[model samples]
Each structure stands twice: as structure tokens, then as C-alpha cells.
Target: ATAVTGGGASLPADLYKGSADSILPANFSYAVTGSGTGKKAFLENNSALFSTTGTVHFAGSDSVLSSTELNTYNSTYNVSGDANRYGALVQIPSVATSVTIPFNKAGSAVDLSVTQVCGIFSGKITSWSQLAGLGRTGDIQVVYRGESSGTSELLTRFLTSACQPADVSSSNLKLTNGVPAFSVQSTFANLFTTVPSNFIAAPATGGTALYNAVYAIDGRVGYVGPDAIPSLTDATKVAKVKGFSPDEVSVQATLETAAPPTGAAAENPANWVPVFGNPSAGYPIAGYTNFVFGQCYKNATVGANVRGFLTKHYGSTVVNGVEQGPNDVAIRAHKFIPLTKAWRDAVRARFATATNAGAVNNPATCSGIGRPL
Candidate 1:
């Protein structure tokens, strides 16, 4: 069968479980590489696919390519629908989750402002005592992702936009994983080159490694998608972002309030800002994980297969006010929230428009253009 290779955001590995295998061919594969890796793989397109004896198709990513970037690729390969209208790819916002700061301690009501996190991760404030009013004092053990990651990008967006306003001068402090814009590299130019004493560990990549390090010690703090490491929830105290807990009520509200503008307005290049770090939303560390796909594929059947895979297994749809999807339970079980209906519908609409197929569309051949064997 035509095999698919999707590597990004380890949390989405849940969707690739055997239970969902029937949705696609059993041979399809997903690599739980971080977002930057996946985006680069996805951008590589057919070069990484259909080589030698067999072929793999496109890559998957949680972060969307910018309109300019999407169109740049569209010039070479007409990926999705009208390149002029949809801009080469459809960004199906797949899921929402909190980028939580997991600390080794428990029952400590730690409310962290964006400023505190900016200081902590940048290595400016290194002691637990440096945080005012925690009523405790100890060396802070900071754990961080050592690779390019969407989780890192989300943290970057928060630190640059919501945390340090123009008034927050750079004269006294230094920063890294600098952001407001999303790039796989350069985000960390100001980040972890230096760490303080008791700065214990850094994950080789992604949250899974970071999660492992967080559980290994006390006075440890690391950032991750709580859903990406479900068991870590009760064991660690997740930081309250800007005084707002990362509860569903607050997180869902933030997404609903900052709903992206619809249709062309939503697709506007300049308007395509990441929403993870808005203090006004209360939950500063929020993200809508998206699955990026082009409107068209070189293999029409394969294109149809991808569309089916995404519409069925990707995000969620709302009925009345409740999210209703076969995957909803699994998503929540993993500590993630469903994307709103608008995002889901837009994705499905693009798929139908691009390939003239519904979620039920089937592949033309099991071993089509890029089948590995």
C-alpha cells in the first residue's frame, strides 16, 4: 500500500496507534520527531518520497507554513487547492493543548507570570527563592528541550510577545529561544547556551525526553504539552500561566475568544499570528496543533488518502456545544482538547475542493506512486 511518513509533535503518536490502523493501510508509518524536523521533511516533499525501489509520501507537521512560504512551494508543486485562494496547503488545526511548566513539587500554588518564565528559561533567575512569594527557597533545576520543537516555538512566542513588552528593557537581562516569529532554528539564539548551577538536565529532543528528566528529580521544572505526557499531570504541579490555570474551561475559552478570522481573512499572511502567548486570553501557553497538507498531490489517489486520513483521524467536530468525534475520548484521554468546528470544517472543505473526495475517499491502489514495496 502507499505508505505515508509523518514525523512531528510526539503527542500525535496516539493517533497512529493500532486502533486507528484501519483508517489507513497497516503499513503507513509515523515518526514522532519534533515539529521542526517534520516541517523540514514535509517541505522536502517528493525528494524524500518515491525514491529507489519504493516511495513514501509527504510529511506531517503541527505548525503551518507561512503564506509566503506556502506560496513559494506552491510555485513548484501545486499542493492543495487554488494556490491563489488557499495558498498551496490547508492547515487543519488538529488539537489544542497547554504548554505546561511541570515542576517537581506538588500542592504549591505557583502562579507564574510570563516575566517569571522568561527569566527562568533564559537563565536569568536561577533560584526558587528568586520567585517572590513561593514561601520556599532552593536552587531551581531547569530542564529544557535541546532540539528544535513546536513546543519550544510556543514558549518562544509567549516570551517575546506577552512577557516582555517594549518597556521591558534588555539592558539588565539576556534572553534566548527568542520569538514572536516562528522559525525552526534561531529561536534559541538567546536560549540555553549558558545555564546556572543546579541546572540539571536537557532533553535530547521533544517533550518525551523532557518528561523523563522532570520525573527524575526534585526542584525540577520543565515545559511540555501535558497531554504529551499524561501521567505527569498529577505527579507534578503544572504552572498557572498568568494566574490562569490550564484547565479546560480556561483553555477552551482562550481559543474561542481568539478565534482566527474566517476564510480569506483568516488566511491573510500578516494575520497568521500564533495565539499561544496572549496574556489577555489568560492561558498564555496555549496552542492549536495543525496538520499541514497541500491541496493537490502528484498522486491523486494518494492525495485522496491523505485527505481521508486527516478528516477522519486528525481533529474534531462540534455538535451543538459538545465535541463529537470517535477520536474525542482518545484525545482527552491524552490530555488534549478538540479543535473548534471552524478549523475542522475548513480542513474538510479544502480536502473536498482539492481532491473532490470526502472523508470516505479510498486510495486507487494499495501500492500506488509511493508504496514502499
Candidate 2:
């Protein structure tokens, strides 16, 4: 049997793993590496870090490839003259989900308004007693993802957008050095000019590790994917953002507002990144997890396997006499929002249409550019 191996973005690790186990025809494996590491493996075409054997076929990332990264891939692998070149890189917005704020405060239903969340995370509200509604009094321990992470990128995007000094006020938006500017970044530590005193960086990478770090300490709060909240004990609770919980319905409400590019714009890799930007309604902290694939492959079997896997993932077509269906059941079960029918149809149409610039054409049709295993 053909074997497909890829890794990146711990936010979607559980969903990908479940899909692999239940849907894919080939033996499939996904490593729980961060998005940065996943992009590196895909760019380098090296699976040494993820698996002892097999080449990296695809990458799962919440953060889309930057302009520089896309240019580098196009120049290196998509060149017309290169014998082993691949076609243009194909980036698909796979699924949307919320970035939840999980805090450890036993027996308390924590509800944080946008202002209060900004205050707590920015180091102004250093103690739990500082928040009026929390009904608890203890030093607030702020845990953050220490390593490169897409979860960090998603949360910071919301924080940077909603927690602006002018918007949140000086009292609630205090950073270490007199209201330093916040920017969207994959490394949480970089968001601050000087790290806040109450902030503790998690020693390990990934969403699960960061969640665990928060769980280990009482009064600890950190941002994580909704998938990580399932492991929460009774003592721990997911904080509601502005009276809205990070449920499937709420997340989907925010995601519905996203206007993903279609037609020619869809061919551009950079256009795939959805910028929700702190919506007034629903769960505000939400983003998409992207699947990055090479448009063509040197090996027929690997290409076929990947195509089949993606078809099942998008619920575009039936495979093995079974309609695998949309990933809504698994996604909703894990507290994530499933892709809308329109989004799925758009992607499936792209994959099936060879005339499109970055379409995932059949492996046998590849000529000058076919990414090798």
C-alpha cells in the first residue's frame, strides 16, 4: 500500500489523525510538529524530523505561506527548466476553528470581556481578584506557547487587532514598556517588546504542551485550540469571550463572514489566509488551518493517494464505494467548525480542473515538474 506522511500545526493534529485512521486508502501518518517546522519540512522535502522513513508529501499549517516563502518555492521547485521540479504549490483552506482561552480556576465559570481579556494577557490585570466577575483571588499566571506555533499566530491576530491601546484603553492595555505595539506573529514572546512579568513561556512546543502547562498551574491561563479543551479536567474551564463561548455554532458564525478569494485570486497562495479580525458577534478568535500540497508528483502512487485523501477530506467525491462525507462530524466533535459547502465545492473544483494555474493535476500528466518522494 502507498504510504503518505505529513506533519505541521498541532491545532488540527487530532482531526487529521482521525481522518487518516478512518478515511484514507493508504497508510497515513501526521506528526504533531508546529506550523513552522511543518512548512520547513515541506519546503525542504525532508521527512527525517517527522518519520524515520518516507518523504514529506504535504504540510498542515494554520499560518499560510508568506510571500517570500511562496516565491522561494516557485523559483526552486516550479521552475520550467528543472527536471525534478514540481508544479505550483497548492494551498487549500481546509477547516475553520476557534482559538480558546483555557484557564485553571476550579469551580468557576470564567467569563472575560474583550477588555478584561486584554487586561489579563497584557499584564495589567496581574491578579485574578482584579477582574470583577471572576469571583476568585489569586495571582494570574499567564502561560504562552514558547515555540513557533500557528495557535500563537491565530490568538495573537485577535489580540493585536482587538487589544489596541486606543481601543482597549491604557488601564487594560498595559504591556511591559508603556503600551508597546502588538503585531500578529507565530511566536507569542515576540508580540511583546519586553516580556511581561506574569507571563510564563511553555518549555515545549505545540498546543497540547501549552495547554498542559496551563493545567499544571493553578490560576494559569493560556490560549489554545478548541481541540485541547477536551482534555480539560473539571477544575479547568474554557473562558467565554465577550459572553460567547467557543462552540461550533459561534465559531462558524465568525467564519461565515470570511470572504475567501475565488477564481484567479484563489490561485495565489497568499490570498488563502483568512483575516477575521475580531468580529463583533460569535467567537472572535477564529482562523483556518490550511493544507499545503504540491500540484504534481513524480510517483504515480503517491500522487493518487494524496488526491484520494484530499477528495475524501473535502467530501468532493466517493472513494472505495463509500461517501466519506464532509468532515463536520469529527470537526464539530472536536469543537471546530466544518468548511461550508461552497468552500468545499470551490476547492474540489480547483483540484479537478487542470486548466487552473495551481490545479492538482494527475501524476501521470506531469512533465517538467513533478515533486519527487
Candidate 3:
């Protein structure tokens, strides 16, 4: 059996595992390394990042590849004149989901408007009592991911887009210490020029850890994927965003309005821009998880295995009497929204052997170098 290994993005680790289990023949395995480590492993073909030994076939990252990483890959592997090197990097949206705000308020229904959510994360709203709706009182302890996390990237992206001066000021948003500008970054702690007194970093990384951190402290709030909501104890509850709850329906509604990359821009991962801010309807804080792959693989067997897995992943094939499409049972069970048919079709086209417009050419015929082991 050909073993295919991938690591990254703890948010989608469960979904990936389910899919891998359903698809047979290839001994597919994934590591729940955060998006940062996943990208590094795939880029350098370093199994050390995963704390195991195997060829790094692919990476699952909610965060898009940085320009620096792209440039490094192109310069080192996708050399212009070397067909022996790796092919163009392929980054495609795997699924859409929302970043849910989980708060440790116990039985209190917290419906935070976009502005209020922004205020809490920005260090402007220090106490829960400040918000008129909830008659709660306590210092709002903000729990944030300490490690490089794509969840942080998605949440901060929404903050950077929605928490502008104009938006915050109109609601009498106070900045006692003056919060730093939020940028779309994987590291949440780095966003603050000076870490606020009320803010607490998670002792560990990933959404699960952040959620656990929030649950441990009273009046604490943190961001995590919708999947974590099912495990919420009575001590914790998910906060609604702008009247819309974080669930598959709300997340899918938000994504319906999002414009995915199309035409000429579809081929390049850099062009896949994220939908900024909260929409008038649907969940406010949502983003897509992306899978990073090389256009071609150095090993033909690896390429074939990856292609087979992705084919089933995108719903092109039925395996062992099961429809292993994007909208599989596991995805919905995890409270994640699968990619739409259009998005799925577009992504599947990338595997075509023929020169389809907007499609990344198939690995077998791609002129670029193959992915390193």
C-alpha cells in the first residue's frame, strides 16, 4: 500500500481523518499540526515537523500561503527552466466554515453584534457588563491562540476588516489602551504591539486548546471553529454573531455571497481572496480552509494516490458503496459547510490531464518539477 501523509490545520483534522478512513488502498494519514507547521513540512518535505517519518505529500492549511513561502518554493523547487523540479504550487479551497465565538458565561445567551465582538477582541470592551444586552458583570478575559494558527488568521481577518475606526467609533467604541491594528496573520499574539492586561494566551495551540482555555476561566471568550461547539459544556456556550449563529446554515449563507476566484485568477492560489467582514445576513466570521498541493509530484505513485484521494474528496467518484464527496456525512456532522458544486467543479478540473482553461494541468504532463519527498 502506498502511504500518503499530510499535516496541517487542526480545525479540519477530523474531516480529513474521516475521508481518509473511507477511502481505501492508500494508507492515508494526517497530522494535526497547525497550518504553519503543515506548510513548512510540505514546502521542505520535512517529516520532522509532523514528529514522524514519511514523505509529506500535501498540506492542509486554513491560512493561505504567504508571498515569501510562494517565492521560496518557486525559486528553490519550481525553477523556471528545470522540468525536473516541482511544478506550480496548487492551493484550492477545501471547505467553508465559520469561526465561532465561544464564551464561558454559563446559560447566558450572548448575542454580540459585529462591533461588540470587535470591541471585546480589540481590548476596548473589558467587562461583559459594558454590553447592554447581557446583564453580566466581570472582567472579559480574552483567550487567544498562542501558537501559529489559521483560526487566528480567519478571526483576525474579520477583525481587520470589521473593526475599523469608523465602525468602532460610531458605537462609542472605547480604546482605553489603544489596540494595535489587526492584520491577517496566523500568530494571534503578534497582532498586539503590547499585549493587553485582560488578554490571556492559551497554554497550548489550536482551536481545541483555545476552547479549553476559554472554558477554564469564567467570563472568558475565545474564537474557535464551529466543530468545537458540540462539546461545549454548561459552563460554556457559543455566542451569536450579529444575530446569526455559527452553524452550517449560517456559514453556507455567508459563503453564498462570497466571490471565489474565477476565470484567469482561478489558477493561482494568491488570487483566492477571503471575504472580509460580516455580511448583512449569515454568520459574520467565516472563511475557507485551503489545501496546498504541488502541481506535479516527483514520484508517479504518490501523484496517483493523491489524485485518487482528491477525486473522491471532491465527490467525483464513489468508493466501496459510499459517496465520498465534499458534502459527506462527516463534514456535516462536524458542523462545517462543504464547498458548493461550482467550487467543487472548479477544483476538480485542476486534475485534468488536458489543458483546461483555469485548471492546473495534471501531474503526469506538467512541465514543472515534481514535489520533493
Candidate 4:
């Protein structure tokens, strides 16, 4: 039988590690690679199944996979239809209470605002205490994304939005990961992340080497993803991008207030949501992670492969004692709130275009799992 293969970019590690055992490969062996621009190379022949954060730039080149990126995909792969997301990129923010700041000097929670954050990166605030309303003083060290990573792109976009235009400068601030563009080793630079796949786990903290400064110094603050470190119950206690807390409530609000960016610019700086209960308010530090699929294979073969691979993710599972995301239990466990009624309906409609016939094509889609998995 022809093998069933699908590629994935970085997002939920749970999804990554989970897909291995869960997905059904016709031959029982498939390659699930984790890289940023490598997708363009792998998809060169269109023989593999895959997805990625739409490139802001192809990097190492003047333009992104401007045309041919998806070309070989059409000829080589047997996708169901044209591979395109009628969806927006998941504009995520660096806001997990678990994803917080680490300072060298020991003390209590710090107080920070959008202005202060930019100040820290730009070398404005030279001490640790200035970040806190208490003005605590200590040695200060700054760490940041290395360079040219999607996460860096997302974080940079958010910071750019938060800072007063006049207060901001130096567009070349996309560093910390420090891996030069196109360097093979640089691929993982974003893992701890200038990029996410570049994540290298450390034994001391069980986190990534990206935190080299924090691990080595006394007063240091760096921005990292949720699963990166092992501490941080509240990243907001340390700093906020715009005087905003990093909570789902806030994230949801931001998305609603400022429309998600269709471009790589990461738009909507002021759109914020309240962490407590104000969806009407929007979140200042929040965004989404979208899954892109290319469906252009010959007929039902495409549909069958897509369905087969994702079945487990959609299968019954226990996540935070509720049903959501890839499976019912999984997404909820990670604290990713469920989609709104309007959003769900819209998703089902889009899925309809990929397949043909009753079981899936019907109006009523995947829902109502408050009960069994």
C-alpha cells in the first residue's frame, strides 16, 4: 500500500509527541519532521504531507516560497484539493503564567508595563528593580530571541505594537538566539526559541539552553514559551506587554478586539482582553495557533489519509478533565479554551470542502463531548 505521510511545524509539543503513536501510517512508519523553512525543501516534490507557519520570508533568500513552495506539492503529492488555509495565522503571544521572566536577584513578583519591557530590551532600564514598582536594585542581564524565528517574529510584532512608535527603534533587535540565517545548526535556534523547533533541553532546569543567561547569572529576564521552563505560575507577575496579564481571557479578548493579522506584521497592538471575564475587552497578550493542510491528492485517497492521521487527535481522551483540542482531554489539559459557537460552525464548513459525502459533509460536525470521550 502507498504510505500515508503528513508533516507538522512546531506548536503544542503534546500534539507533536502524541501524533507519533496516534497517527496511522499505511506502512506504520512515517517521518514527522520539525523545522521552520525546511518544509519548503521537503515539499519540493509534493510527495510528503505537511504544514508550517506561513513564512514571513523564505530566509537565506530575498523572497519566501513565493511560488514554487507549493508547486511540487501539486505535482508530487496526491492531496485532495488545493492546499490553502481559508484561515488566519494563529497569532500567539508570549503569555503563559508558566511562561514568565527570570531575574537574577531574588525577591518577590515584579511590576512591569509595555513601556518597561521595551525599555529593558533597548537598554533603557539598566537595573532589575526598576522593572518592579518597588524599584528593587540589583545586577541586570538581558536575554532575547536569537534571530529570525517565528516566535521572535510574533513576540517582536507584539512588542512593536505595545511600544510608542517614538520610543521604539532598531528593527534589528531580533536576537538572543543568535544563530545566523541559513545555518544548519541555526535551525533549532528558535526552539528555546528565536524558533521553537530549536529547543534543546537542559538537565539543570530540564528546559532549553536558550536560558543560558538566566542559568548562569543573577539578574536576568528573558521571554520564553510556556513549556520551556519548569517554574512560573504567573508570567504577568513579572511583566506585561502593555500593562496586560497573560491569560486565556486576555488572549481571547485581544483576538476579538483587534482582528488577527493576515500579514506577517502581527497587527493590533491595543486590542486587549481582560483576564477575569471581559471577552468584550479583548486580550492584550494573546493569539491563536492554526494547523495548515494541503489537500490536492487524487480523489478519496486524499480524504482517507487526512482522516486516518487525525483520528486519534480527535479521539476521546482526558485533558484537564474536559474535552477540547486534538482530543477532548488534551486541549483542556493545556488550558487552551474551547472555540466559540460561531467559530466551531465556521470550522466545520471549511472542513466540508476537503471531502465528499455524508459522514463528514453533513452540517452537524464534531461536537457534544461533555459526556464520553
Among all candidates shown, the one with the greatest TM-score = 2
How badly does each model clash, as a count of residue pairs?
A: 11, 0, 3, 46
TM-score for each candidate, following the candidate numbering: 0.74, 0.88, 0.85, 0.55
Candidate 2, 1-373: lDDT as tens digits: 6677788898988877765433334376788788988888888787886865656878889877888898888888777677767777778887787888888887667778777887877776788888896688899999988777888888878888887575344443325346554577887777665677789988686888888998898989998888768732232388888766777235445656666678778878777666676776676888888888887876667766776666666764455765434566666666667776666766666664445444565434465457775
Candidate 4, residues 1-373: lDDT per residue as tens digits? 5443334233233333454333233432222333233244234423233333221211111011223444443444423342431111111221122234444455555556666766665455667656556446775566543432333333444544455533433322333334211111222233222322212232221113445556566566665444344443444234543433443344344433443222223221111111221233423433343333322222234334544543443333346775443443334444444443233333333332334221221123211110010
Model 3 misplacement above 4 A: 18-26, 166-180, 231-236, 248-253, 257-264, 272-276, 316-326, 352-364
Q: Which ten residues in a row have the lowest lDDT in candidate 4?
A: 55-64
Better of 1 and 2 by lDDT: 2
lDDT of 3 by residue, 1-373 (tens): 6667787898888777755433223366778878988899989988888878866878888888888998998898777677577667778777777888888886567788777887888787888889895878889999987778888888988887777664444222224246345567688777665678888988775778888998897999998887767742222388877666776235444666656677667766786545545555566688788888766766667777766666656754456875446456666777777766656665666653235433334534564446655
Full-model lDDT, candidate 4: 0.36
Instruction: Compose the digit string of candidate 1's lDDT tens values, residues 1-373.
Output: 5655555666455555445422334545666677766665565453342222223354444455655666666564443343322124445566677677888764557887767776676556667888898766777777766555677767666666655533233323343345222223213434433434555546566677887788787778887776555543342377776666665335544656555455666544223334655645556666666665544444556666776666666445566777665466666776777655665565555444434332213233211222222
lDDT (0-100) at residue 328 of candidate 4?
A: 30
> Candidate 2: worst 10 consecutive residues by lDDT?
167-176
- Cα deviation at 81, candidate 2, in Å, is 3.0
Candidate 2 pairs with clashing backbones: none
| Model 3 / residue 101 / CA error / Å | 0.5
Global lDDT scores for all candidate models: 0.56, 0.74, 0.72, 0.36
